[PDB]
Amino acid sequence: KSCWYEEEIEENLRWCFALNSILHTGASQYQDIALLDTKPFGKALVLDGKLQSAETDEFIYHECLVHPALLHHPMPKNVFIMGGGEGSTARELLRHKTIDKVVMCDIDEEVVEFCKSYLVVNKEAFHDSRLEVVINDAKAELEGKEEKYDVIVGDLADPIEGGPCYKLYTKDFYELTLKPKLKKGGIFVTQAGPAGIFSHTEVFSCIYNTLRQVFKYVVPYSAHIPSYADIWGWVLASDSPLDLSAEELDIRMRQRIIEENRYLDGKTFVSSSTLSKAVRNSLNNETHVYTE
Amino acid sequence: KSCWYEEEIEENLRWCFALNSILHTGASQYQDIALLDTKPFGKALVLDGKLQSAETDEFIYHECLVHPALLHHPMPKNVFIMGGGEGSTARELLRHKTIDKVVMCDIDEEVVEFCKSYLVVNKEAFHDSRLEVVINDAKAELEGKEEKYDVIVGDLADPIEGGPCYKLYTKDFYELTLKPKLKKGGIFVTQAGPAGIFSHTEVFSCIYNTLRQVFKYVVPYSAHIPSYADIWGWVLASDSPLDLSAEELDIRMRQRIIEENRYLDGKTFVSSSTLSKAVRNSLNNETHVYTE
Amino acid sequence: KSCWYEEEIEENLRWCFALNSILHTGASQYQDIALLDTKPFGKALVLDGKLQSAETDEFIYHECLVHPALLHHPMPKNVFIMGGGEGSTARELLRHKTIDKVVMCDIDEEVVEFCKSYLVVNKEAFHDSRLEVVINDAKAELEGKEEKYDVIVGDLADPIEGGPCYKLYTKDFYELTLKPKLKKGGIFVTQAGPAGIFSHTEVFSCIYNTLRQVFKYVVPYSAHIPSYADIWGWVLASDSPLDLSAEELDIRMRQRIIEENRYLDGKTFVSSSTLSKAVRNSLNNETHVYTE
Amino acid sequence: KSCWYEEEIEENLRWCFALNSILHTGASQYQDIALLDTKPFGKALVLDGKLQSAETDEFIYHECLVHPALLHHPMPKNVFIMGGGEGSTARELLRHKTIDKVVMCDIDEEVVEFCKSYLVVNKEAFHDSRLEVVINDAKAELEGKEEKYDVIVGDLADPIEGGPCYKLYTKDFYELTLKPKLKKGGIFVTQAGPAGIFSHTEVFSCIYNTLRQVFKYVVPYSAHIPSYADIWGWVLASDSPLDLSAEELDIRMRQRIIEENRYLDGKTFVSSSTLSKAVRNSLNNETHVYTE
Numbered sequence A, B, C, D: 001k002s003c004w005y006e007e008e009i010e011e012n013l014r015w016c017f018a019l020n021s022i023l024h025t026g027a028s029q030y031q032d033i034a035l036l037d038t039k040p041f042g043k044a045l046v047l048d049g050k051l052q053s054a055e056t057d058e059f060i061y062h063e064c065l066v067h068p069a070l071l072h073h074p075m076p077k078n079v080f081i082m083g084g085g086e087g088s089t090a091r092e093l094l095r096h097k098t099i100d101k102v103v104m105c106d107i108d109e110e111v112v113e114f115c116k117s118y119l120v121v122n123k124e125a126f127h128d129s130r131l132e133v134v135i136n137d138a139k140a141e142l143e144g145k146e147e148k149y150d151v152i153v154g155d156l157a158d159p160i161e162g163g164p165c166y167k168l169y170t171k172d173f174y175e176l177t178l179k180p181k182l183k184k185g186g187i188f189v190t191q192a193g194p195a196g197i198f199s200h201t202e203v204f205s206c207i208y209n210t211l212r213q214v215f216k217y218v219v220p221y222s223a224h225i226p227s228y229a230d231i232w233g234w235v236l237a238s239d240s241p242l243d244l245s246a247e248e249l250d251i252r253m254r255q256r257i258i259e260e261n262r263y264l265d266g267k268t269f270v271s272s273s274t275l276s277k278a279v280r281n282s283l284n285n286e287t288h289v290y291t292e
């Protein structure tokens, strides 16, 4: 009844969850950090007052971010995460039997240490001997090391000039920093912001067009995340083709992933990658490219 | 920043729209009626303080409810609407060159008169000489008249027991009243409530399962409606198959529908009818059947 | 900006405080108990989802309830509190050098234990050897014991019929139970509900009028409590006059009260007891008397 | 239930009124303008999203602003309002039989024209032959004309550097512009912002200390305004004494004011001008003076 967490999604639109408690908090120079216990969505990780991960449905975002990319790869062994302090991207990646090493590269040690203690769903992930945590800006980390990867995962905030993430979505970053760090058959996947019928023009279409300047094959896809009050997007990108059937995705899931996915089967992916009329038109007509 | 319409759309969950004004109110024996002018979604019809339709995205619901059914029919000429006092369903039907008669059978004359007075977008539709407005319970109307239809459209409220709508979702209604009023090769479509990852179990899987007990061919499908903050569902049912490629649907739309759809092309429908893993599972494993 | 406690303090009127956290909860046969940490008002005790006391301004209510009564008495030595489980009333009484015994008679042991555990400001007070805590309905306690008091203090909820408090505001209670338990020259004071320009008619004028039927001298007074968003009232009653200058009150405070009052000096009390035009009129013209 | 007007009083504090409607609006380069129909406070004039005047209680603000000043004057005939577009200050001034001319000088013609049509409580005031409306900055108007007044009334917004009002609260304005425009026995009164136990340090005490540098006799006073969620302040200032009894105020009200005041009698004024301990201490220790 009485305690509420409130979020301004758009200037004109508010989304409010009744609270059981405010469990813990932290803060860093990068962002405020909080963990709420919400009645409709259970525990919820909030960074800078924006909801990031809710207990009841974070599996949707993290399965969709991680699995398509790994499943389109013939044999993905080494993966780098840009972001991922929250730990659930690493969790889903470590469900893959083919994985030897995951590097999580988060800029904010405070998110890592907070989530490692308090998002206990990710506890085995954080303690898995295949995981290396690096506290750095993912752009400097990628630039200063020569190691190559089978999959690189963008789990960053949306591109906002002056914020710490924008540079990790430019054409130059993708071409001159990222692509050289992908092995043959390498696949890049990034979160790509809201992807609703109106909200898709904010960053999703630009992220798509940006990737399209750099990688030969670029597959945008999207899914509803109840707690975000919108459809969310992701984009796969590769110089090897990205075209597998629902059933081949399902066979690889069965063979390579420990436990059953809760959201994603191969049919769900094919649906996800078939965008609606207006969304396809936007992405196809998009001329804007992120630069700097 | 200061004026808000707020609705508790699930318990512990409020969804709030910035308000420009309250344009007109109304009432009937059945419900309170309001037309709000909202900032994020334009003019919004609210019945008993539940949002029904919002000017900026009602095209999504109405294109989805109408066009798949008619497009899957070889030559749909006459169509009966159960409910639909808001007028947009009729608007979308009347875009079809094949259609020579639309009956709108809504139990609430005040809703019809209100929307006729105040929904500018549906003025032409309400005054199309193909449209007959009938004020009656649709169950009674379908029983007492012998006329058959190529397409019957359910534009009613959700089935919750003791509602004025429950009886229009029962096996017996469908078997004994509705089906006998479909012509040979006739198609039924109904709105089917929330279709979100967890909300799809409230009524969508029951409505699907109930129609499965009466029609040979049943195709469920869903789409995000921004102003509802959920995915919403519809269900096609027929004793002839409902099976057309995306390319065939695009052709039929070009040949039969006046002007370009804003939401729906062929690939959009295919995608809509490819449900996600957990939703497909619920539907395929569902046992409840609506009866009284 | 994101976490809020909200209370509908009148119908159609919400008052919302930014929340830092929910510190502790509790419950009893009588009420839900919460200690919130709020931004504008510090720690806030909430009973059945109604704010009782807020750390930053409870001094106002408690100074106002306590000090005028004792200051108008020549030598107040023993005092009985009806209610007061929160502990601040007792805190303020025990500041008086004259006082040798305080009985706190609260019907809810859980409230007392909660506040003893969690209200740091009242720790010393709860452990003052002058204080006796009694767990009982104050009406029953006053009846079954023969001891008389110099001052009796009402720190109860408002009288609304069927409340556990109503009976403690009736003419008969005052006449038959309370007055017989005042020593010669004894003073009663009670909290008297809202005292705002329009809210003063709910209970303040009735409580004043009811006490007028039993005591020769009745002085009503009021002060703004920021966290209540209203003016609040109290009423002094005695069969000896209650009549002291501001200068005399300032002297008595300097000689009898340990440390400086934060809210109340002599001129503040004079001002508090000078009600506004419409409030004085209501009081002077009031006819309702609480009985059962 | 569903439509709400919301106001952030403090960063941490929200105050929300259920709405019947949004009646009219206007806007100017100076401020947004709206008239809401609220359930708890009736019609409400809101400028820049801050509530200014509510139907149920604006009489409190406007009686308190206007009457003390005029009633302490021996024979006030000519009055100048700085602000007053809303019309209620003029209304209350025109209830005085001694008044020959009222000049309302508002910077924003749009407030004047809006309120003249839509705040019909002020309609006789706006049409009274004794009222002259001037559209100007009150500082330029006062500076460029030689006419002197018996009473000058500040009905402006709070002093905020860079806003259009700050200059009308400086020492230099008061000494070199205002005082020369007051006749012998002239009295200045200004609204002086919030005056609550904590909120009084924002502008009230500074406005008091500022006036104290310029006028020999300065009387601060305050009253609760339910719709503002706080105690509001005003300050009288004169080089002739300001010291009348409750009863002399009452006799002058009876003789000179048409109709009965609803809020103010002379006792209410004496109470109003007796500030509480902490408020008096603040005002007396205040060293800050508004300059420029």
Ligand SMILES: Nc1ncnc2c1ncn2[C@@H]1O[C@H](CO)[C@@H](O)[C@H]1O
Pocket: A030, A047, A082, A083, A084, A085, A086, A105, A106, A107, A108, A111, A136, A137, A138, A139, A155, A156, A157, A164, A165, A168
């Ligand atoms: N440049 C960056 N490199 C790595 N992680 C980042 C960067 N910017 C933001 N993040 C992390 O991304 C996550 C999502 O915002 C957060 O954990 C945040 O700390």
Ligand SMILES: Nc1ncnc2c1ncn2[C@@H]1O[C@H](CO)[C@@H](O)[C@H]1O
Pocket: B082, B083, B084, B085, B086, B105, B106, B107, B108, B111, B136, B137, B138, B139, B155, B156, B157, B164, B165, B168
């Ligand atoms: N039994 C019914 N027959 C026809 N229309 C109905 C019935 N019950 C509700 N409606 C209409 O359905 C629409 C959606 O609730 C409303 O316009 C309502 O009037």
Ligand SMILES: Nc1ncnc2c1ncn2[C@@H]1O[C@H](CO)[C@@H](O)[C@H]1O
Pocket: C082, C083, C084, C085, C086, C105, C106, C107, C108, C111, C136, C137, C138, C139, C155, C156, C157, C164, C165, C168
């Ligand atoms: N009849 C009563 N006797 C004593 N205390 C009471 C009674 N009813 C309520 N209270 C106490 O009054 C306080 C204020 O409501 C609470 O602590 C409550 O427990």
Ligand SMILES: Nc1ncnc2c1ncn2[C@@H]1O[C@H](CO)[C@@H](O)[C@H]1O
Pocket: D030, D047, D082, D083, D084, D085, D086, D105, D106, D107, D108, D111, D136, D137, D138, D139, D155, D156, D157, D164, D165, D168
């Ligand atoms: N400098 C000024 N002179 C006159 N009126 C003003 C000035 N600044 C603000 N106002 C008016 O004061 C009123 C209260 O904010 C509004 O009607 C506004 O237009």
